[PDB]
Design a protein around this ligand. Structure first.
Ligand SMILES: Nc1nc2ncc(CO)nc2c(=O)[nH]1
Ligand SMILES: Nc1nc2ncc(CO)nc2c(=O)[nH]1
Ligand SMILES: [Cl-]
Ligand SMILES: [Cl-]
Ligand SMILES: [Cl-]
Ligand SMILES: [Cl-]
Ligand SMILES: [Cl-]
Lengths: 264, 263
């Protein structure tokens, strides 16, 4: 069984014009449709990853996700909030979203008691931008990721966060290293990571730099390479996938699972 | 190593308007372009596929492909002619195409001595038309079919190393998806039993539509998944509607495999 997270970036190109003004009604419509075809969970991202973007204040993040939580009130369990701001996480916490997705892997223990009371699940992502000899090399990646999760899981578990609420994301692309080889090594040997961690795995390879470096294509021609990467990840222990093309991935999952039933 | 055939259907909706008249210049432009990104080979199909279509005469087939061979004469080894008409096949031989792709599997021996003198390769496709074939009967029938057909080609002088075998997919096997699924799922035994290179064309076929429940133009992703499985199970050639997509997934898969560390 695979659970598909569909990416909803509230600050992507299609949500503003020359007035630099964001469209809340447009995002609500997109999120409803996503949940209708393709996305098991919609992953709402209020922070900008634009090269010139300044940090987004927590208050702006909350104002951006609040209208979306309003429209999805009767299906909170299909909502994930993609944010590293603890105040945004706290706000989404109390409103009862299904998931908190943190690229910093919840490093502030002052938020742990608030998380233990709630029932949401946590996507705990490893980020190698923590520095020793330099960038994360392939031969060290697996041990680094295991030691990272060993420490962060046991910290959350010490504060009352049950283990069955935890989803572990190894990180991909530049979150692992500027070198594509490190992401390729981790993805290819994902099964060994899954066995050593013993908890469900999520990956998000869709449109990442290391795909572009591998096939030599710009970010919007990476749909097919992403699908190949995702199907490979699913076959090697990934239980969750975060992707820009969720309906595409689901229909490929359905074909793969149906085809496996005919193997002799 | 995979060779990707890009489908060029000369009678798809993009190549005619209300004049019911085919546009060869648009197809030439499409062919040159798909060769530039993705397609190792372009599979040129002049025979209609419409539900209300009558058969296409060989003269019309030849008229439709002639401008394409004109535009690709300096790279004929990258050209496959998708036709079952022996007149169209003879014409293509005379202009030295790289491949003859016959969904009837070359059943007319009158053509063999002309093929034997050429140096093209042949895509010999198996079909249930000679229409229900069950999964339990599928593999033995495909093997027995090719054993007779391959021997008959070789005995008329067509060398074995020129042959590419296609099991057929979709309605060429059965109206039910189960037979295509069984054959695709167990493609490796087919390859080892036949011992010749294998081509499959699953792209957009009915059995994908029935498996994922999607119309023919939402089948890109399911097709890519099917294609990647076929490649991992002995397919040396793949005929697809999205050749640039497939080549990019193959490049990623081949690169990823190099990072698998022992056991
Ligand atoms: N869990 C997770 N979330 C992400 N959010 C944003 C981005 C990139 O903007 N990447 C990721 C990712 O790789 N994993
Ligand atoms: N070799 C080959 N050719 C085909 N041409 C047309 C179509 C469908 O129009 N299918 C095939 C196929 O499955 N294999
Ligand atoms: Cl409501
Ligand atoms: Cl999609
Ligand atoms: Cl021989
Ligand atoms: Cl038919
Ligand atoms: Cl093989």
């Amino acid at each position: 069984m695979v659970t598909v997270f569909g990416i909803l970036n509230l600050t992507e190109d299609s949500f503003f014009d020359e007035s630099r003004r964001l469209d809340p009604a447009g995002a609500v419509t997109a999120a409803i449709e996503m949940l209708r075809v393709g996305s098991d969970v919609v992953d709402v991202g209020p922070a900008a990853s634009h090269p010139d973007a300044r940090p987004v204040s927590p208050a702006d993040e909350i104002r951006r996700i609040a209208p979306l939580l309003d429209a999805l009130s009767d299906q909170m369990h299909r909502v994930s909030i993609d944010s590293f701001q603890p105040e945004t996480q706290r706000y989404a916490l109390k409103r009862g979203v299904g998931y908190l997705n943190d690229i910093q892997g919840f490093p502030d223990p002052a938020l742990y008691p608030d998380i233990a009371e709630a029932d949401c699940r946590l996507v705990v992502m490893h980020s190698a931008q923590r520095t020793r000899t330099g960038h994360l090399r392939p031969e060290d990646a697996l041990d680094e990721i295991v030691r990272f999760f060993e420490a962060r899981v046991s910290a959350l578990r010490r504060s009352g966060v049950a283990a069955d609420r935890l989803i572990l994301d190894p990180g991909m692309g530049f979150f692992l290293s500027p070198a594509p080889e490190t992401s390729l090594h981790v993805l290819s040997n994902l099964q060994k990571l899954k066995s050593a961690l013993g908890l469900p795995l999520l990956v998000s390879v869709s449109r990442k730099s290391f795909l572009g470096a591998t096939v030599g294509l710009p970010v919007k021609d990476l749909g097919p390479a992403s699908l190949a990467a995702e199907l490979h990840a699913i076959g090697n222990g990934a239980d969750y996938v975060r992707t820009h093309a969720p309906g595409d991935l689901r229909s490929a999952i359905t074909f793969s699972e149906t085809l496996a039933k005919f193997r002799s």
